[PDB]
Scaffold this active site. Structure first.
Site, mmCIF file in Angstrom:
data_model
loop_
_atom_site.group_PDB
_atom_site.id
_atom_site.type_symbol
_atom_site.label_atom_id
_atom_site.label_comp_id
_atom_site.label_asym_id
_atom_site.label_seq_id
_atom_site.Cartn_x
_atom_site.Cartn_y
_atom_site.Cartn_z
ATOM 1 N N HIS A 58 -98.049 -13.102 -8.659
ATOM 2 C CA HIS A 58 -96.911 -14.129 -7.976
ATOM 3 C C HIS A 58 -96.915 -15.381 -8.058
ATOM 4 O O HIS A 58 -97.094 -15.704 -6.802
ATOM 5 C CB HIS A 58 -96.367 -13.521 -6.516
ATOM 6 C CG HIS A 58 -95.765 -11.834 -6.569
ATOM 7 N ND1 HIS A 58 -94.072 -11.587 -6.169
ATOM 8 C CD2 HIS A 58 -96.246 -10.694 -6.888
ATOM 9 C CE1 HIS A 58 -94.113 -10.497 -7.034
ATOM 10 N NE2 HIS A 58 -94.964 -9.827 -6.952
ATOM 11 N N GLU A 110 -98.148 -3.217 -7.472
ATOM 12 C CA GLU A 110 -98.606 -3.408 -8.818
ATOM 13 C C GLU A 110 -98.314 -4.502 -9.651
ATOM 14 O O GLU A 110 -97.062 -4.744 -10.028
ATOM 15 C CB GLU A 110 -97.699 -2.077 -9.362
ATOM 16 C CG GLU A 110 -98.489 -1.479 -10.591
ATOM 17 C CD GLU A 110 -98.471 -0.202 -10.900
ATOM 18 O OE1 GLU A 110 -97.046 -0.513 -12.605
ATOM 19 O OE2 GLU A 110 -98.488 0.418 -11.526
ATOM 20 N N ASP A 142 -95.069 -17.044 -4.306
ATOM 21 C CA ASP A 142 -94.347 -16.519 -5.281
ATOM 22 C C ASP A 142 -94.588 -17.052 -6.258
ATOM 23 O O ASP A 142 -94.646 -18.903 -6.644
ATOM 24 C CB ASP A 142 -92.993 -15.740 -4.737
ATOM 25 C CG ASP A 142 -93.341 -14.279 -4.759
ATOM 26 O OD1 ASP A 142 -93.128 -14.576 -6.442
ATOM 27 O OD2 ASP A 142 -92.949 -13.783 -4.144
ATOM 28 N N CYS A 173 -113.055 -11.378 -18.871
ATOM 29 C CA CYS A 173 -112.376 -9.694 -18.371
ATOM 30 C C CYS A 173 -113.177 -8.679 -18.832
ATOM 31 O O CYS A 173 -113.156 -7.901 -18.394
ATOM 32 C CB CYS A 173 -110.968 -9.965 -17.968
ATOM 33 S SG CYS A 173 -111.164 -11.522 -16.570
#
Ligand SMILES: CC(=O)N[C@@H]1[C@@H](O)[C@H](O)[C@@H](CO)O[C@H]1O
Ligand SMILES: [Zn+2]
Length: 469
Positions: free
Chosen positions: A193, A258, A130, A270
């Site tokens: 995360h 999400e 995380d 991207c």
């Protein structure tokens, strides 16, 4: 009157009208007349007779026999004779530990596993990564150890926290759990995360920030790995290969909640990749990312699991999602049945064991209270019969560890609500009642005190002290 105090409640108990003062195991047979996960335990004045359909049912029967021996240790007059025929309502009964937020040493994991096995849990979910830490060692990526597994403090306490499991420790844990009938499920969150990952490997990300540090507070991170970079996919191939070698369950939890896609929108790589593939926005890019990850897992012989998002569109029929949002349980049940998905019930209204169990205990400014009775109110199918909700695989209780720095706090918050979760996962509704469960838990205070040397008593003021404010 005289009865057993077995948690979870067995599917069928037939008491007999005499007393047994010994539980010496006189017979122990594997029989084809029982399912592989079922058992029959007969208590007689001469001792106990165990039959099981297989290794799993035998492990469950030995757990029940241990609870009976703990009861007998407290009743010198003896316990009732009878016949217990038992098998679980759901095949998935899980707890989740969160070593990413606070590392859990291997011995504490062993104690946790013993306690959860005492209640016939069979799934242990490791939230390994995380924003606040990365606990999975991956060969070829040593910064994960030197950077991503260390953080400077936690919520401003000025106390460094660090830790990372070894491959050997993880294989030891796997074997330990298997010997106790528990399968281990790793979770590697992606593409988000990943603040700790960014602190370790900033070049994996759209906007590399060399000054990035492992997160020491809660909250969301906007840092997503860049799907256009080949080193990202090389790294995830390495991670998945390590998981394949360590965890034989072959199940990989990818998180899947999400993620904020602002940086993907701004990323020139991207941007041109979405234009080149005629992607409308970043949700199509997220779909493509998870399709690629699922193809990788499938080529490895692994299967993905997700935190359910209703309008995500990243799922394939047969895959498994977790219901987790407050008040979305029935909607998730019906949506997964429509979409051909399997569902694990982990709804935060009943299953989040990081929340305080008594009103007034530390809530850190946002946590609602989930009492033991509230927890026991949980029916994983929410009124639906098995013939209508057959895609529900079971129940799952996460013990998020933002505010649980050691095993003492972890167990204080996890128990005794984990006993309620175990009974919800195992016992059919016909044998469940709050009164019976409360009586049995009153006895289980002494049971746990004797067997694990742990105190399950819960008052408003006896929670161990914290160092934060
Ligand atoms: C997928 C997801 O968002 N999981 C969060 C977890 O990160 C957090 O630690 C916990 C706190 O209770 O709440 C869960 O909902
Ligand atoms: Zn990018």
């Amino acid at each position: 009157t005289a009865q057993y105090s077995i948690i979870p409640e067995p599917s069928r108990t037939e008491l007999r009208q005499e007393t047994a003062k010994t539980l010496q195991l006189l017979s122990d047979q594997e029989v084809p007349t029982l399912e592989t996960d079922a058992y029959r335990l007969t208590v007689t004045p001469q001792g106990a007779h165990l039959a099981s359909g297989g290794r799993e049912g035998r492990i469950y029967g030995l757990a029940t026999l241990r609870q009976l021996r703990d009861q007998l240790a407290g009743q010198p007059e003896g316990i009732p004779c009878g016949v217990i025929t038992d098998k679980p309502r759901y095949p998935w009964r899980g707890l989740m530990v969160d070593p990413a937020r606070h590392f859990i040493p291997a011995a504490d994991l062993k104690k946790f596993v013993d306690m959860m096995a005492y209640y016939k849990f069979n799934r242990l979910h490791l939230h390994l990564t995380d924003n606040q830490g990365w606990r999975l060692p991956v060969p070829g990526y040593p910064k994960l150890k030197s950077v991503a597994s260390r953080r400077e403090e936690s919520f401003g306490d000025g106390i460094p926290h660090e830790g990372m499991y070894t491959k050997q420790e993880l294989k030891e844990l796997v074997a330990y759990c298997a010997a106790r009938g528990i399968d281990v499920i790793p979770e590697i969150d992606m593409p988000g995360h990943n603040q700790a990952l960014h602190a370790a490997y900033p070049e994996f990300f759209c906007f590399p920030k060399p000054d990035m540090n492992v997160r020491t507070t809660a909250g969301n991170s906007k840092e997503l790995v860049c799907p256009q970079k080949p080193e990202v996919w090389k790294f995830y191939a390495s991670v998945f290969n390590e998981l394949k070698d360590i965890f034989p369950s072959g199940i990989v939890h990818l998180g899947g909640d999400e993620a904020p896609t602002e940086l993907w929108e701004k990323c020139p790589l991207c941007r041109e990749a979405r234009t080149r593939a005629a992607m409308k926005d970043e949700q199509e890019q997220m779909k493509a990312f998870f399709a690629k990850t699922a193809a990788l897992l499938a080529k490895n012989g692994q299967t993905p699991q997700f935190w359910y998002e209703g309008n995500a569109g990243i799922y394939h029929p047969g895959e498994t999602v977790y219901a987790w949002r407050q008040g979305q349980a029935l909607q998730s049940i019906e949506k997964t049945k429509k979409a051909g998905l399997n569902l694990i019930m982990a709804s935060s209204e009943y299953c989040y064991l990081d929340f305080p169990q008594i009103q007034g205990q530390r809530n850190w400014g946002w946590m609602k209270t989930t009492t033991l009775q509230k927890c026991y109110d949980l029916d994983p199918a929410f009124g639906k019969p098995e013939k209508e909700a057959g895609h529900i695989r079971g129940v799952h209780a996460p013990v998020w560890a933002e505010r649980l720095p050691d095993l003492n706090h972890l167990l204080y918050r996890a128990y005794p609500r984990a006993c309620a979760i175990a009974e919800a996962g195992w016992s059919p509704m016909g044998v469940r009642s709050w009164e019976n469960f409360r009586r049995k838990l009153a006895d289980h205070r002494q049971f746990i005190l004797k067997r694990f040397n742990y105190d399950m008593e819960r008052t408003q003021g006896n929670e161990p002290a914290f160092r934060w404010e």
